[PDB]
Amino acid sequence: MVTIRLARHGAKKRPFYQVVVADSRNARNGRFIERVGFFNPIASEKEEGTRLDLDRIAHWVGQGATISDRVAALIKEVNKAA
Amino acid sequence: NIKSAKKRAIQSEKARKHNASRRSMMRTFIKKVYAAIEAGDKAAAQKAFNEMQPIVDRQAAKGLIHKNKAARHKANLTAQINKLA
Amino acid sequence: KIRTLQGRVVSDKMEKSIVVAIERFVKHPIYGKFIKRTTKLHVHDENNECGIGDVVEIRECRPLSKTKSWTLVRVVEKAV
Amino acid sequence: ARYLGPKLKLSRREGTDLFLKSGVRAIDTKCKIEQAPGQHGARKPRLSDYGVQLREKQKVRRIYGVLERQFRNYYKEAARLKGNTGENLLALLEGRLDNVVYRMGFGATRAEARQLVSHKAIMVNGRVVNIASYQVSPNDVVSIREKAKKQSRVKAALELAEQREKPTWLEVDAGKMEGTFKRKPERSDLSADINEHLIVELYSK
Amino acid sequence: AGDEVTVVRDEKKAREVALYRQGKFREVKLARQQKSKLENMFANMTEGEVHEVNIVLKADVQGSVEAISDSLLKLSTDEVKVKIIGSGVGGITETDATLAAASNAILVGFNVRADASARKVIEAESL
């Protein structure tokens, strides 16, 4: 079943997560339906850090997808930065 | 073997012996239905049909004989008896 | 207009059945000449009475026994 | 990395100084300038077409202070760029941090400039940079740092800094020890000194 | 067997010492290579009435292999000379059987026995 989850493709002691909608029975780097955002741990003073299309995610959640606990916190953080 | 799945080993056997007994009764009744169909007594065929319908759906709800197989059985065994009748 | 193709018969006796040769023209990738490739398909057809040289319209279907997953639709003219 | 040998042996082999000394003496006196680079070296000026290509390659590498693998990396990088490949080659060679330090005159020689970038004295846009092969870009302020600025090392440089070349592809201060890189070096700044139309050819031999 | 183990600071340094000691074993290799030629002129046998025996030996214990091999070279006469080629430690292996297949010798092992990759050579040529 579909889960929204963070996949780890960053560097050694310097992660870079890719939030993605994918099946449960497939590995962390395995098959997924489409990309939906990204998360740099070092957001800093540059004008982007956390980005995630909510119109895709609320659509997949409405069709029944569950949200991993980090992404669930990040959705209620990232808002309009409100 | 090595790990604690000796529990799952005894679990499948007991359920097998349970399911096999119901499947055995299911098949012996379906052959004694098909006996009447081969015999050509249309009333004894319909009486035996009226015997199998609860039992075939009851196993279908238990699920071991399985749903769409059970429906295809009631359809198929209908088609011979309602030529005979 | 839902998918359909067109070919020729070359089919003997075979109840509810016809075999159907479909010719097409394909470029060889290296040399670029166009050579006619022949895709022979077994076909279902109740009331089987197409002639050997007859040219037949064809469409895809469910498996109607093995190898027979196509079905005829129209036939143009009668060969002999 | 670095050469670590007699500086004048390169200058006699290459056929002019690389500015590896002060300029008080030794472009005409201590040097034996082009007289002979080694013991039998009096007796030949003849050379092949491969050798004139390699000699200018060696001249450019021995000017800028870089090894063949690193210099090949600059040639490959100049190749993907739009605009002239030879011009972007010489731009990548000129674009070094230790080279801008040499242009500002903060280090008297290119080796002293590299020593000065190595020893943690240099700041670019308020970052410190130890890496010699840092590249200086448009609108990069550049400086020697405040903490232990203008020691006897830098101070000795500043005298011959006053009157040599001082061109316009850097803005030069040398009062508070800084500079600003506005315009890029361009073709007319550094051509004809090097056979650049030749040097760009040579890797396809 | 019969010599010193010492604990050490670091693993990396005890590669470097071991590779120096391998250099020392190569010094003992070149010593044993030089000695045989200058003792009697010849590579092996001086006189024309030549006979030898070769053996291939593996003892289970490494202290034993070095001691009893010396006692098998002790008993020899001049006319028939007996010599060890390729002393092993532990079980018989593919390459051990291969040496006595290459050059004829008797293949013996003390409490040592054959293994599968030796058996593969032995079933082919039963040395």
Add this chain to the structure above:
RNA sequence: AAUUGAAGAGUUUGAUCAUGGCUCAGAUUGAACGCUGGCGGCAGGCCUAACACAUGCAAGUCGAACGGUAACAGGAAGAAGCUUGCUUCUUUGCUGACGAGUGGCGGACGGGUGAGUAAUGUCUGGGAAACUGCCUGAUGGAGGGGGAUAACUACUGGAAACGGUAGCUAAUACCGCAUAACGUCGCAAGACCAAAGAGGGGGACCUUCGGGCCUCUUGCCAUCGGAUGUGCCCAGAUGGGAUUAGCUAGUAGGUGGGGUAACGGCUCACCUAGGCGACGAUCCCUAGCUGGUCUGAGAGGAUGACCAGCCACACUGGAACUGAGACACGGUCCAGACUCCUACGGGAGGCAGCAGUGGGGAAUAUUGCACAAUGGGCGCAAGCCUGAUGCAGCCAUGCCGCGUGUAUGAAGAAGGCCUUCGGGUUGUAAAGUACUUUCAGCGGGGAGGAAGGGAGUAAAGUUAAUACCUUUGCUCAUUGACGUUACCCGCAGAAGAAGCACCGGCUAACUCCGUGCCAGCAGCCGCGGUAAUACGGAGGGUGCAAGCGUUAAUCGGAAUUACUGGGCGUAAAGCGCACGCAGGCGGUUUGUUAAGUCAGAUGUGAAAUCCCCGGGCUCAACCUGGGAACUGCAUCUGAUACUGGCAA
């Protein structure tokens, strides 16, 4: 912003021009060997025996489904020695729990491997006669009963593994009945199929004072849907060989019965006699494939470890069960090979999981640390488990960064080497002087990866209930495996840190001495028979650098199998000559169709990745945003010159 991309040389002759092979300069590698090696970053690291394996670990989890005390941690009562109010010791499920056990779900995922496998597979594009755990939206039920049985007790066989006999006992386990359309089967009338409770707290009624009963949460069941997942079918493409040319009995088709979740020769019975085959069947040899990687100017070629998708396999061979899902890598049974233990009677095992070992081979690593983070399994949560993963160890293997000092310094020191013995060179190099101290060495300081979760509060929603619980805020305790982290500051003093190949022509860079067609060098043509620029040694020189060289390997150069892009009079090459079927190609005029072809549009062409434009890691490598590419394909709508079809 996205088309800046392609070199030749040496060598057959006395000499020349051709043809034509051979050879080299290039780039590249999961590399080895040789010699030498300071520090750091990042990436990568058994391609040999699908050969066998010691020892440890690799998935279990719910007491909120259930008997229970086997735990052991408290409490209480009581029985008792007193400390005289408390300690002590027997009971006790009272209570935080919780082994063995019962039941449910997980064990079918991930991970490892390339043996078999040339298409049944894979890839692309389409399709129809199908199912699909958990997970969500919708509409409604959740009634009433019953019988066992393991565990556990009492006996009893065993060396051990592992059991036997007889009773007792619960459940969201098991089984009846009621109840049932919009569901299944039927033309319809009709027939028939489900249930399970558990948990928190609380006024009222009352209770055999256990709770009844209310209210909230959650689970159970049926059905119509979702998205997902998987099975199925068809077309085209996807190794080599004609010294493999004939191949097929369930074979090919039909009907009917039976079978699967479902189409179906799927399987029977019966009927008919076909099917495939030069567009390469069949057989054999050989091989996991693709997105891609590597090379290449492009076209092409080679290659498919890394990374991801898919497929296949799990000591050898075969079958089925359980279950939603397996014909099941650490499940079961049986058969086989083989290995071990043993009291010898009888029992036990499958590291191509992670470590690690024997063996193999030129050759590929530590019997490490942690659930801190990400993602999983179970659970309501806590929590527990996680050899996935995050990290570390080892290796100059590759890529990349940096250092091994800087400036001055002529008497151009001595020595070495050459020397027409006039001098020249090694060599501003050294020496000396004046300076700097990166990175190491040493002593001090210190991000981020940590968001959450837990506990306490408040609001809001909820409810008969200020309850009580969740949601949504607030507040306080906290949560770092790596870790002596990244990174920063202070100190001493040039101190600790350069080697390797090559120098006849090719090919950048030259003399002397020794040896004397010997010894040896050689990638190629070749050097040496006393004055060797080609051997050995030295001096000198050049290239390249913590690597260097050799070797093996692939493409290149090679327009040297020639599509782009070749020849065939005499150099290799036109069948001895002819007729001829299959095949290729076809004069000229008109109409028509629109297949090929050409245009347009939509969908699709996984992502990583390459390219183009950017950002961020102290800078690069590396990481990362966005675009382009996505070179193709299919369907649909168009165009009608050309070719094809059709008509005259």
